[PDB]
Amino acid sequence: MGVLRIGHASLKVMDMDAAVRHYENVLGMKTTMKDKAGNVYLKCWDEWDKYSVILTPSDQAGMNHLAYKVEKEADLEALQQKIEAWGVKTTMLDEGTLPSTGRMLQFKLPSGHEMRLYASKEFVGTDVGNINPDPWPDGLKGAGAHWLDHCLLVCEMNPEAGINTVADNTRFVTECLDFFLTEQVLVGPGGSIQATTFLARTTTPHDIAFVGGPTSGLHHIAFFLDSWHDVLKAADVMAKNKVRIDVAPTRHGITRGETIYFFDPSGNRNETFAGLGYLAQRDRPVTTWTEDQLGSAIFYHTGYLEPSFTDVYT
Amino acid sequence: MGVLRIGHASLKVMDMDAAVRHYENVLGMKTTMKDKAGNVYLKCWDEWDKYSVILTPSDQAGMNHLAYKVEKEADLEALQQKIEAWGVKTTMLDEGTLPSTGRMLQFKLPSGHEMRLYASKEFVGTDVGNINPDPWPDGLKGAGAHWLDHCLLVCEMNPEAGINTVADNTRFVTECLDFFLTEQVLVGPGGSIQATTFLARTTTPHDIAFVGGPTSGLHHIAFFLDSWHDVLKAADVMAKNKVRIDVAPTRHGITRGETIYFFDPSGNRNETFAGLGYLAQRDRPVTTWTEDQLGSAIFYHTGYLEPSFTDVYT
Amino acid sequence: MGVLRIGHASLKVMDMDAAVRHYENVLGMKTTMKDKAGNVYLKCWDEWDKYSVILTPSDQAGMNHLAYKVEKEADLEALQQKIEAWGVKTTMLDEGTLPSTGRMLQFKLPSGHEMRLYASKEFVGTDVGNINPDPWPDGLKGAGAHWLDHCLLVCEMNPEAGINTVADNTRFVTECLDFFLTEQVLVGPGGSIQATTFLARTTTPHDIAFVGGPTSGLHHIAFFLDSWHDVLKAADVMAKNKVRIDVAPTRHGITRGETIYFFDPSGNRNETFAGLGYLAQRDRPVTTWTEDQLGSAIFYHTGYLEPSFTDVYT
Amino acid sequence: MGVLRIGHASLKVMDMDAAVRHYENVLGMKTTMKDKAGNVYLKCWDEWDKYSVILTPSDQAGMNHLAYKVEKEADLEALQQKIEAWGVKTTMLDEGTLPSTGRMLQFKLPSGHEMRLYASKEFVGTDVGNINPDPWPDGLKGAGAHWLDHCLLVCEMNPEAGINTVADNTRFVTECLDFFLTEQVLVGPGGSIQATTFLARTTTPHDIAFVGGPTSGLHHIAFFLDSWHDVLKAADVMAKNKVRIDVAPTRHGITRGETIYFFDPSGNRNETFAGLGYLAQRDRPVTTWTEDQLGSAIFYHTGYLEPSFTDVYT
């Protein structure tokens, strides 16, 4: 029972034509529907539900909400009682609040982000089918991202004021949603302060992650790639589209995943994440990264924490 | 709760010196202990428990038993009641039956194979540690296999006699151990007969798999590799050790995983399995492979079902 | 001065529609022209001359002739005098004998194959241009082969009758065309008989190669790929087109190149050759492969000389 | 006849122990000899001559000289007459001027760099041999660089003063040493000024290259890697040794080669260059890169010319 994976992310974009061009040409997604309000919904080729990305017209960038899919409809009631016992108020938007989407349990994380849980979304199938399917589909576009993999949220953190929503989010998703912690960045005196956590429901290194910041926001949403070679191909695609690259191809110390950071035409950061990294397990010890090696935990090859990583978000 | 992953596999070897040489030099495992009976225990570098391979002196090849790790000790009692309600008798070997191994729930699958469930095994840690760890360890040997990934069992099947232990094993591990079916090979009239199934507890395409055969035996145990390039490196290692290769580097249609089939110095087949393939999910539709494309489901590149795949096992 | 690289290969095909489909869909070539006689000319994306493959309607498979490009027009006269001093008669087909092709020096190798040398062919340019070009072109098809890389000729060999056209071809292209020998397979007593030679004009392991056989024929023409990953992608393409694969992805012991052997719809063998292998140099010692390791020289991963390699050619 | 490839590069290092540690542990070279003056000579595993790197104790970084190997001893006299007719004075250091090195033709390029040509250097062979050799050697260290691939020289350039040693070096190595130009960066009004040139003797995109600068110096010496995956492995090695990385893994627009820029413990820049890129040919059109796309020619993925590329050299 419970959460299966990340379901979709709703982003604010300032130019819908350019944003749809970016997520279709660079990452290889397909527009699946547009509702009466101009919101655009997109999915990756190796996803089977209707959409994993919502683009909403706005005056600014940023994230509206973040959604995770649960196994069955009855999970929402059980998780709702666990969440509300913890002290977080929930509400239940019923079927059709979003198009092709069942009812959704809605609540705010301690960091202030809106999170939704749904059990039902319209099935459309992957772009390779499920009867004698090919490993990849013909006519893939751009980077050919498999699926929306995870999301990193910037969480308000002020240790001198006693505020650490990374720690409160980590305790919330573990005790209420039964995520398990895979890796953590420990800063402060002797690593006594959680500044970055990576948690999972799948057996991948992370499906959600929290990083500390002055305010709460969206650091990036990530899309899965198979291999290091696909990261090279994805980097070539971004050059052909003059995509503004935040971080050139390298490897993360955390999760061991190979990565590229880049921006959409509204400022939202995206990531092409490559490789399984390792099989995350509930009996696996939590990988601890210390403050003296803070740069190697994020950008392993250089050991150099980019100022853009900890200063630019939406 | 319940099963986490494959725990270890106990194999029969006829030359212990040569078998240990093979699993250390070719696959890159390390011998962790040898008990008073001459049994040798080995682990991969990206595993943290004491051992994932047992080599036992024998007059023949084959598999002794297959073990899976569960999350907590209390899972064994709950799973024991589920298994025994289904009709399978179980027994409980207590701590120390195997060295550095907790108590084990022991039972036979419908196919006749002995399966064990344990919650506790001595922790030793991965070869890269858990404090600011490197992505890979220095001084890796051979193929540098990450971990024991899965096991494919040959299961007695006789449709004209009404015998299909692949179907009975599939129903058993789903209803009792809460595995979920990811892919299946359907043969017979209109694909009405399950001849090969792939089931998972992790979010990888399979942790266990059953293939039909005249008798029940071991088809292969598999070890995980990161990328297609590592399959090339692994193939070079097998050439340097004159390993007898069953199937040269290619891709599986099922799981999309890139693979090599090769034998140990006793005849047991091993596999170097590369890539995640896809994120297995309980809401994902079961990939069905039909009998007309039976060759592409196993060896995707050629569409040619090797006679060795369906004729050679131990 | 002298030969630069392989220029084109003229093949006999029995079904022109199917052969053009194969070389366009599988290898990614483009049809550039068709002459009044129905001959079809094709080029790869990373070639700049008009064509590197000629498909001629025929009752059988096989090779018509093999062409190499020289640096300048005056090279033909100088090479003609060297060839005719050696004892081989030459002729000069003038401009337009083939469409978009300058004059051609025509002669027969000792093995009986017809070889042509030309200095001029119509320039069309690569599919990425030469002003701020992309590393690869958008809309590549199939395997996306870079260029016609080399050709392996089967050469009549009968040591008990004193016939070895592999040795005579090797001495001819070295003494007359100034190729240099990179690797050789030595069989017979103590490796006293050249059964396979690899010779180069570029600094790649081979631009031409000769292998012994009962008769003289075409073993395969090869096309260059970048990496091992592209060999995986090429193998996936052959599966999607149900291409009959001769040899699944593996590595050659000679040249160190990763490879796939496959057939066109007429029986002619093709190869997708990946990697530089090494920088061939005239001061580099000739790599010698002995008869006891004959299988590893061809198919390095298995050490198993496929019967198809030495028995099937056109 | 003439130049075959780059032969060796003599570098100034300020800490010999640390420099030897770097070139052995990071790039995987082996120390082959040390002369009476403390100079250390190193070679890569896929080279067969005695050394390709000279480390000389000095108070500063920088390059002493650059050496290229010619095919035969008589080439030195012929090239000497061509060079001296052009207007450059030469001298001939005889055998043993450098240990295990034949006589050397010595002269200065128009940019002021000292270049040497030799025909004879002590043969030691590659680390895999030449009789049934493995594709790679067991016990490779670090990145496992194949060979010294090329060298990029910073050349004094002052267009308002009428000084462009990149253009004078390009004309010199073409007219005297018979290099051929593969790619060029054109700046100034309408691309009328050569600011960067890439020239070759092999059929690889470049064996020497010149880039304009305020003074003449050494930009980097490069070492060849096979694939993009090896660049990932090389980047992991630099992290394990806390190598100061200039440019993280990316692709060059010129040559299409994948690359990493990093420094030795004296400040000299090194490069791990991956891939053939393309087959350089004397009939291939020169790839022209314009000033508006100057960033994409160097760092293709970002289109962002690093300030370090054009500001840091020794």
Ligand SMILES: Cc1ccc(O)c(O)c1
């Ligand atoms: C440090 C890190 C690891 C993995 C990620 O996906 C990411 O965004 C950051």
Ligand SMILES: Cc1ccc(O)c(O)c1
């Ligand atoms: C068909 C198949 C797919 C994946 C495997 O690991 C395997 O052994 C077989």
Ligand SMILES: Cc1ccc(O)c(O)c1
């Ligand atoms: C033995 C070998 C090596 C390289 C080739 O291209 C080939 O066809 C055969």
Ligand SMILES: Cc1ccc(O)c(O)c1
């Ligand atoms: C632009 C460029 C291309 C290739 C190289 O090796 C290099 O140093 C620079």
Ligand SMILES: [Ca+2]
């Ligand atoms: Ca994930």
Ligand SMILES: [Ca+2]
């Ligand atoms: Ca698995």
Ligand SMILES: [Ca+2]
């Ligand atoms: Ca070639």
Ligand SMILES: [Ca+2]
């Ligand atoms: Ca070169």
Ligand SMILES: [Fe+3]
């Ligand atoms: Fe991420």
Ligand SMILES: [Fe+3]
């Ligand atoms: Fe398997």
Ligand SMILES: [Fe+3]
């Ligand atoms: Fe070939």
Ligand SMILES: [Fe+3]
């Ligand atoms: Fe370079």
